[PDB]
Amino acid sequence: MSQERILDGEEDEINHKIFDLKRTLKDNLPLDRDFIDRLKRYFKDPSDQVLALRELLNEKDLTAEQVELLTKIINEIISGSEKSVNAGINSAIQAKLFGNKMKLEPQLLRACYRGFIMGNISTTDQYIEWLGNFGFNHRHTIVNFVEQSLIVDMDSEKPSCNAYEFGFVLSKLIAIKMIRTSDVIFMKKLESSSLLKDGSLSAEQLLLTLLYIFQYPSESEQILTSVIEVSRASHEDSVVYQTYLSSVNESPHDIFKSESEREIAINILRELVTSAYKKELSR
């Protein structure tokens, strides 16, 4: 149905918002102008407005004349944002499935996928944004939601992107599934090394540190500065460096901008770990 995909209100709140605009047209030939302004205020979202008008087209007989004036309003909203409306309609069942799975407001999820398909930010900045928006806990689930909505958006009769845009969006999603793979790996290293174990360090900021090493491997030493301050007070230095180093070697290679831009990171961690060994075995 076209009503189930409306994420702006409760089950009943949608029924009444739709009947106040079903009774507005039940006048049989009323005022369509300014009634639009009283529909754009019922449902602020373009995906919700368009699905509402689709439910008005499901009832007869009002009808064979104003159905022409109704479908021209639908195309009035859609014409300007065909990608935003289709991305929010197509991914509205997954936003409902996952919004309850993670206990999250569904329209927050539809806005996440809809913003993913038309965002020009690096694969890392995306991962980092979803981490802040949806919390540490939902940093892996949010990428299954995005992937599951993409699978549905494609297999939909009115997708948001064409073959080429759906091809590129998937490469942005393979990378994000690689960032997650090294996130999982790193997390296995943080527990065995048990640095966050005492309570001083947060696993979130520990992760953030790793992401920045992926972005700027040259400033790795400068990056791990905030960690060292909180690390010294309890743990070593050949421990924090070994955690990041062994994590990198067994992580997906393409995460870095290149293979030699990957070297700038492995070499700095190798130089920093061995330089920490001789200043620890020296005392």
Swiss-Prot record:
Domain of life where this protein originates: Bacteria
Any one GO cellular component localisation term in the record: host cell
Subcellular localization(s) per the UniProt record: Secreted; Host cell
Keywords: Plasmid, Secreted, Transport, Virulence
Entry function: Necessary for the secretion of IPA invasins.
Disulfide links within the chain: none
The protein's name in its UniProt record: Protein MxiC
GO biological process, one term: negative regulation of protein secretion
